[PDB]
Design a protein around this nucleic acid. Structure first.
Lengths: 96, 57, 79, 124, 53, 107
RNA sequence: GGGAAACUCACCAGGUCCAGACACAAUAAGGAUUGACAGAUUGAGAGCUCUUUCUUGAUUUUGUGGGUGGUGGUGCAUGGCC
């Protein structure tokens, strides 16, 4: 999809930070929940990631559930240029 | 349909080393005088403000 | 809050049916056999009953943390 | 050898990409020069009719501030150094095009080779 | 940016849809469950709607 | 210093009658077993949510109708409990499928 | 579950948009490409299209393979329900 690099990095930053994105199947929403882009930019950037590995998608009642995979974790720690052992919530959480 | 261009070389650079900004710049606070204003028929018109700020000049 | 008991208990049922469908799609390979959900103060608990919990949990619970994250995003719980 | 022959430039440009400050292209970079954002300007030499050289050499060497340059050739090697890596077994094998002007903005980073070519131009 | 892609949908049949299958026709809007009749017929034992008499 | 009495109110609402009566019996014994005073569990009229739908997904066939229903039972117990014993009885008696709502200040 | 003004809507007379993933090949930072004020134009304050000349900056465009969508067909290919 044609989209600004600012917004594509917004999506990918949120996805590497969270490891997971839910997204209502609702184009023309103009504001995703928890990202400040369109809902369509979220849905289509996540689909463009699905076709190259890197993320998986379940549909389940009008709500795309996106889940970052390991190959994606490598790819978008490369893409966001963070150092190794930084991120997504592969968590060993303190209280849980 | 994107009529293409040759380049953007709309400066008059003289010899050594004086430059000049032909087609004076946008005064709006969201365009830090880097962009230019088009000159149609008196039509001074900003492209970065994609709609707004047409000037009478 | 400020929902009638009709709408509240119907929405609790719809939340259960939604969770059941989402886990029937997400955990079908591990033999997911049905959730139960217990509201407590400060916590709502979602007991997955699969048969193969060694593949529901993952490497030190990495998979079930995703599912907790998925459910808490989509139904908008606080983390 | 033992030293690096303008590969220090390659490294500061490769770091200049990734925090979004390598304004590459003629127009993107001359828009950077005509405001106070330019920090290090890199043109080339082998072009045709040289009004592009003439313009960028006039705008980067005003007698007001922010005055660096380097004149190294090979806009296509300036593209492989500037921003387009399509490696695929990175013995080059890529579809590289020329860049011919690259301007660094905020270089978001720190020490050595920045300071190396910074002193190397701004003190003779 | 397109201000020619929309039209008022504050009401009617096209304003709302089944939350299971996005169908417009034949909703159950009683108690706000907003499922169509055919998907309610499947989800009914899970929502807690049982057949007594 | 703690333990002041406040005239608390428990409302118990559910769709399974047995778990509701277990939690109501739980609270009434867990109040009387260390001596509160109670306006005991008042059975509200059980509300029946009925949804009437056709059996068929298409429109073919003789018109058969189907009345699903969800029963909802409520209770409420007025206690006079000290704030510690309030906290004790309010956290305890959790059950899968019973909803408890506790309010204060009977004005 | 069919009490349709728009939606529903699947039909008609017209105008937009791509929401054509991914991969290859091409073009190309001397700009691959996006958008637009006013006027003509159009039902329309859709820059749809044209004058023009700003903007944009590797996201996209062109060809191939391959996808996605379809209240399109066959209920005499089927599931599920009735």
């Amino acid at each position: 999809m044609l989209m600004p690099k600012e917004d594509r990095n917004k999506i990918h930053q949120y996805l590497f930070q969270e490891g997971v994105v839910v997204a209502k199947k609702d184009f023309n929403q103009a504001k995703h929940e928890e990202i400040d882009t369109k809902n369509l930019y979220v849905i289509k950037a996540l689909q463009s990631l699905t076709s190259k590995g890197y993320v998986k998608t379940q549909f389940s009642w009008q709500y795309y559930y996106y889940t970052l995979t390991e190959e994606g974790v490598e790819y978008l720690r490369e893409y966001l240029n963070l150092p190794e052992h930084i991120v997504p919530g592969t968590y060993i959480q303190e209280r849980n | 349909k994107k009529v293409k261009l040759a380049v953007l070389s709309y400066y008059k650079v003289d010899a050594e080393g004086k430059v000049t900004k032909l087609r004076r710049e946008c005064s709006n606070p969201t365009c830090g005088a880097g962009v230019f204003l088009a000159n149609h028929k008196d039509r001074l018109y900003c492209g970065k403000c994609h709609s707004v700020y047409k000037v009478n000049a | 809050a400020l929902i009638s008991k009709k709408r509240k208990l119907v929405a609790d049922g719809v939340f259960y049916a939604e969770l059941n469908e989402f886990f029937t799609r997400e955990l079908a390979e591990e033999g997911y056999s049905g959730v139960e959900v217990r509201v407590t103060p400060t916590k709502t608990e979602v007991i997955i009953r699969a048969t193969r919990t060694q593949d529901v949990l993952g490497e030190n619970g990495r998979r079930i943390n995703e599912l907790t994250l998925l459910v808490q995003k989509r139904f908008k719980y606080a983390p | 050898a033992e030293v690096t022959i303008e590969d220090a430039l390659k490294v500061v440009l490769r770091t200049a990409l990734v925090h979004d400050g390598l304004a590459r292209g003629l127009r993107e970079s001359t828009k950077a020069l005509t405001r106070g954002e330019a920090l290090l300007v890199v043109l080339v030499s082998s072009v045709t009719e040289a009004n592009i050289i003439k313009l960028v050499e006039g705008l980067a060497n005003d007698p007001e501030n922010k005055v660096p340059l380097i004149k190294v050739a090979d806009a296509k090697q300036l593209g492989e150094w500037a921003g387009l890596g399509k490696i695929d077994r990175e013995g080059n094998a890529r579809k590289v095009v020329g860049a011919s002007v690259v301007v660094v903005k905020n270089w978001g980073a720190e020490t050595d080779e920045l300071s190396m070519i910074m002193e190397h131009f701004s003190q003779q | 940016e397109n201000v020619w892609f929309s039209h008022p949908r504050r009401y009617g049949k096209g304003s709302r849809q089944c939350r299971v299958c996005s169908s417009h026709t034949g909703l159950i809007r009683k108690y706000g469950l907003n499922i169509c009749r055919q998907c309610f017929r499947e989800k009914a034992n899970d929502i807690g709607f049982n057949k007594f008499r | 210093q703690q333990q002041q009495i406040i005239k608390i109110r428990i409302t118990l609402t559910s769709t399974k009658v047995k778990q509701l009566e277990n939690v109501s019996s739980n609270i009434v014994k867990n109040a009387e077993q260390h001596n509160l005073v109670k306006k005991g569990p008042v059975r509200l009229p059980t509300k029946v949510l009925k949804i009437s739908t056709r059996k068929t997904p298409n429109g073919e066939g003789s018109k058969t109708w189907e009345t699903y229903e969800m029963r909802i039972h409520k209770r409420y117990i007025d206690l006079e409990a000290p704030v510690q014993i309030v906290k004790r009885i309010t956290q305890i008696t959790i059950e899968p499928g019973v909803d408890v709502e506790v309010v204060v200040a009977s004005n």
